[PDB]
Enzyme design. Structure first.
Site, short mmCIF file in Angstrom:
data_model
loop_
_atom_site.label_atom_id
_atom_site.label_comp_id
_atom_site.label_asym_id
_atom_site.label_seq_id
_atom_site.Cartn_x
_atom_site.Cartn_y
_atom_site.Cartn_z
N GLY A 238 0.81 -1.21 0.00
CA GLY A 238 0.00 0.00 0.00
C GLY A 238 0.84 1.27 0.00
CD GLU B 204 9.96 -0.53 6.78
OE1 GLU B 204 10.04 -1.34 7.73
OE2 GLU B 204 8.90 -0.35 6.11
CG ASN C 266 5.54 -11.84 -0.68
OD1 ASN C 266 6.19 -12.14 -1.69
ND2 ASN C 266 4.77 -10.74 -0.62
N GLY C 267 6.13 -15.41 -0.74
CA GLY C 267 6.36 -16.39 -1.78
C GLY C 267 6.19 -15.88 -3.19
CB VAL D 120 5.25 6.31 12.93
CG1 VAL D 120 4.20 7.27 13.49
CG2 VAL D 120 5.95 6.91 11.71
CD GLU E 195 1.04 -20.77 -0.43
OE1 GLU E 195 2.29 -20.72 -0.29
OE2 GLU E 195 0.31 -19.72 -0.25
CG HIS F 296 -2.15 -14.56 3.34
ND1 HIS F 296 -2.84 -15.52 2.64
CD2 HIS F 296 -0.84 -14.67 3.01
CE1 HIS F 296 -1.95 -16.21 1.93
NE2 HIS F 296 -0.74 -15.72 2.14
N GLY G 131 -3.22 -3.63 3.82
CA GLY G 131 -4.04 -4.78 4.14
C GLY G 131 -5.04 -4.55 5.25
CG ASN H 130 -1.38 -16.58 -2.42
OD1 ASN H 130 -1.89 -17.36 -3.22
ND2 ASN H 130 -0.56 -16.97 -1.45
C1 LIG Z 1 5.73 -16.02 4.98
C2 LIG Z 1 4.82 -15.17 4.14
C3 LIG Z 1 4.41 -15.61 2.89
C4 LIG Z 1 3.53 -14.86 2.09
N1 LIG Z 1 3.29 -15.26 0.80
C5 LIG Z 1 2.50 -14.47 0.02
C6 LIG Z 1 2.43 -14.67 -1.42
O1 LIG Z 1 3.12 -15.51 -1.99
N2 LIG Z 1 1.55 -13.86 -2.06
C7 LIG Z 1 0.74 -12.93 -1.45
O2 LIG Z 1 -0.13 -12.36 -2.15
N3 LIG Z 1 0.92 -12.63 -0.16
C8 LIG Z 1 1.80 -13.34 0.54
N4 LIG Z 1 2.06 -12.96 1.83
C9 LIG Z 1 1.29 -11.83 2.38
C10 LIG Z 1 1.81 -10.48 1.91
O3 LIG Z 1 3.23 -10.43 2.05
C11 LIG Z 1 1.12 -9.36 2.70
O4 LIG Z 1 -0.28 -9.53 2.48
C12 LIG Z 1 1.54 -7.96 2.23
O5 LIG Z 1 2.93 -7.83 2.38
C13 LIG Z 1 0.81 -6.91 3.06
O6 LIG Z 1 1.14 -5.62 2.49
P1 LIG Z 1 0.89 -4.31 3.36
O7 LIG Z 1 1.20 -3.17 2.50
O8 LIG Z 1 -0.45 -4.36 4.04
O9 LIG Z 1 1.95 -4.42 4.57
P2 LIG Z 1 3.43 -5.00 4.75
O10 LIG Z 1 3.93 -5.57 3.48
O11 LIG Z 1 3.39 -5.91 5.95
O12 LIG Z 1 4.33 -3.72 5.03
C14 LIG Z 1 4.21 -2.91 6.22
C15 LIG Z 1 5.54 -2.21 6.40
O13 LIG Z 1 5.35 -1.18 7.38
C16 LIG Z 1 6.46 -1.23 8.32
N5 LIG Z 1 5.98 -0.70 9.58
C17 LIG Z 1 5.02 -1.25 10.40
N6 LIG Z 1 4.73 -0.45 11.41
C18 LIG Z 1 5.51 0.67 11.25
C19 LIG Z 1 5.65 1.85 11.99
N7 LIG Z 1 4.92 2.09 13.11
N8 LIG Z 1 6.56 2.75 11.57
C20 LIG Z 1 7.28 2.50 10.45
N9 LIG Z 1 7.22 1.41 9.69
C21 LIG Z 1 6.31 0.53 10.10
C22 LIG Z 1 6.85 -2.70 8.35
O14 LIG Z 1 8.14 -2.91 8.91
C23 LIG Z 1 6.70 -3.10 6.87
O15 LIG Z 1 7.89 -2.94 6.12
C24 LIG Z 1 3.00 -13.66 2.59
C25 LIG Z 1 3.46 -13.19 3.83
C26 LIG Z 1 4.36 -13.92 4.59
C27 LIG Z 1 4.77 -13.38 5.95
#
Ligand SMILES: Cc1cc2nc3c(=O)[nH]c(=O)nc-3n(C[C@H](O)[C@H](O)[C@H](O)COP(=O)(O)OP(=O)(O)OC[C@H]3O[C@@H](n4cnc5c(N)ncnc54)[C@H](O)[C@@H]3O)c2cc1C
Length: 498
Positions: free
Chosen positions: A13, A32, A111-112, A242, A353, A439, A467, A477
């Site tokens: 996002g 970050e 992630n995968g 933050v 999967e 997820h 998310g 996924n």
């Molecule tokens: C083992 C594993 C396997 C997965 N496999 C898949 C896959 O193959 N395909 C798929 O579709 N999804 C997969 N996922 C899920 C996918 O990675 C997540 O759904 C996605 O990354 C979520 O995106 P997001 O933008 O919500 O947050 P995130 O990608 O979790 O990013 C949030 C970021 O914000 C940072 N952050 C958090 N709080 C703060 C704060 N207070 N201040 C500063 N920085 C902060 C974090 O450190 C992070 O870098 C997998 C996840 C894991 C853990």
């Protein structure tokens, strides 16, 4: 100091939002809490593999852990470690452990790579207020292109030892009348071919994924974030977490931001302010910031839906023991390529999967990560005593997910005369892991805590992007959905608000 836009986090996002802000000419600072993963470590690689975990594997833990499903074979490589700003964070709540990435790129690091569009009819069910035509006609295609989604070559897949595990489950599922689908990915499948040919350094074919991939995987640092930096209007500050958000007296938002070193030592606390504030800290991180702000009185106009509507995307892990004549292979690519699609939008739906195992010797196990349709939801509730959001989910809330996964895999066992493994997830007999989540979805749900574009209710120029917007389930996924929804949202926000 002041920056026009701040984006918290650098996952999907956040990355989409920052790219589009920068392209619109809005100077943007991304904060970050984890590292920029670009420094060779003690083995000459940026990331540790699954067979050689070290402190880089873990966000502030004192011992490495085996990937879920693999303890029986990978506990032998576990070691004590210094608490360090490593890449994978197992976040433990009362009855649920949620795994998240920490670093520039968020979960894209760990992630995968599986890049899957949800079924349109299911999208329409979960998000009835959103125009599905623009999603499918415009935003999903945009996301797939910019994420660098690609497709495995079917002939190579059929022939390679590295996907025997997938072919075995395909054959077994077929005997039960169940079909498989290829899963698109952001891992470069051309590169993966050349790994198998011994032509380039291995990553997927060297038991790397969950602590990062040293090669092949197009994580967000290579795609959206590289492009955002390329606009000349975006910067990224790392090891900056933050802690609090308030609405300033003179307009906009002010943040307290802790800067730490990689050992977790506090170096400084800074005040950063902005006109436009975008939360991309994930389901867990964004929701925590907002429940904290509500309950500590710094964003007192946040509504009661902040915190609500969390689900684990119906995640359940299970495993089958193959017949001796169906070995899955010692060499299993760490990137899944096939899933079992038994998702029809009913309560029996499963999209599973076919997961590789990292053991590196024959185990006869087939492993699966099921995505199910389970209406149960949890709530993040702020604990002022410890200053943490606590997830009120109980393990019994996953019973419908277990039931759906079990019904599907029971069909496969019946057709093949096989049984489950019961020993992969602890000493107690347990065929279904029901207290983890890869997820996490929800906590700041689109249209509940926010308007239909992620504008936080009660506030202007305050946005959630990630998310936390998704109401608990997408049936696949999730990252392509998060990315596409973020494309839709930021484009509208820039047009109407900026
Ligand atoms: C083992 C594993 C396997 C997965 N496999 C898949 C896959 O193959 N395909 C798929 O579709 N999804 C997969 N996922 C899920 C996918 O990675 C997540 O759904 C996605 O990354 C979520 O995106 P997001 O933008 O919500 O947050 P995130 O990608 O979790 O990013 C949030 C970021 O914000 C940072 N952050 C958090 N709080 C703060 C704060 N207070 N201040 C500063 N920085 C902060 C974090 O450190 C992070 O870098 C997998 C996840 C894991 C853990």
């Amino acid at each position: 100091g002041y920056v026009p836009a701040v984006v918290i986090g650098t996952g999907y996002g956040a990355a989409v939002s920052a790219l589009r802000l920068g392209e619109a000419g809005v100077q943007t600072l991304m904060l970050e809490m984890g590292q920029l993963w670009n420094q060779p470590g003690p083995d000459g690689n940026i990331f540790c593999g699954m067979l050689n975990p070290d402190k880089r594997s873990s966000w502030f833990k004192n011992r490495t852990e085996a990937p879920l499903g693999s303890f029986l074979w990978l506990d032998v490589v576990n070691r004590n470690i210094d608490p360090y700003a490593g890449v994978l964070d197992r976040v433990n709540y009362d009855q649920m452990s949620v795994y998240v990435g920490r670093g520039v790129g968020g979960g894209s690091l760990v992630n995968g790579g599986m890049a899957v569009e949800p079924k349109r009819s299911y999208f329409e069910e979960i998000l009835p207020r959103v125009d599905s035509s623009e999603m499918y006609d415009r935003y999903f295609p945009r996301a797939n292109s910019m994420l660098r989604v690609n497709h495995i070559d079917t002939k190579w897949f059929e022939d390679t030892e590295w996907y025997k595990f997938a072919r075995v489950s395909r054959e077994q599922a077929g005997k039960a009348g169940l079909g498989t689908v290829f899963v698109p990915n952001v891992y470069d499948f051309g590169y993966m071919q050349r790994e198998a040919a011994g032509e380039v350094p291995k990553s997927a074919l060297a038991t790397e994924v969950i602590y990062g991939n040293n090669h092949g995987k197009q994580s967000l640092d290579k795609t959206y974030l590289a492009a955002a930096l390329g606009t000349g209007k975006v910067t990224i500050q790392t090891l900056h977490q933050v802690k609090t958000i308030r609405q300033t007296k003179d307009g906009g938002y002010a943040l307290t931001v802790e800067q730490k070193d990689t050992d977790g030592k506090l170096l400084a606390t800074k005040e950063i302010s902005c006109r436009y504030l975008f939360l991309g800290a994930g389901s867990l991180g964004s929701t925590e910031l907002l429940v904290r702000a509500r309950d500590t009185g710094t964003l007192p106009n946040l509504n009661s839906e902040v915190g609500a509507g969390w689900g684990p995307n119906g995640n359940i892990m299970t495993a089958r023991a193959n017949h001796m004549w169906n070995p899955t292979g010692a060499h299993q690519s760490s990137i899944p390529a096939l899933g079992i699609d038994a998702w029809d939008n009913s309560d029996s739906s499963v999209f599973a999967e076919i997961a590789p195992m990292p053991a590196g010797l024959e185990t006869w196990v087939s492993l699966y990560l099921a995505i199910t349709k389970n209406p149960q939801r949890g709530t993040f509730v702020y604990d002022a005593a410890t200053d943490r959001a606590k997830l009120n989910w109980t393990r019994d809330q996953n019973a419908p997910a277990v039931n759906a996964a079990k019904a599907l895999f029971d069909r496969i066992n019946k057709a093949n005369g096989t049984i489950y493994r019961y020993d992969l997830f602890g000493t107690q007999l347990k065929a279904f892991a029901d207290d983890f989540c890869y997820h996490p979805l929800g906590g700041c749900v689109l249209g509940k805590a926010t308007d239909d574009y992620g504008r936080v209710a009660g506030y202007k120029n305050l946005y959630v992007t990630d998310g936390s917007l998704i109401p608990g389930s997408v049936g696949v996924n999730p990252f392509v959905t998060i990315t596409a929804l973020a494309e839709r949202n930021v484009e509208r926000i820039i047009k109407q608000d900026v």
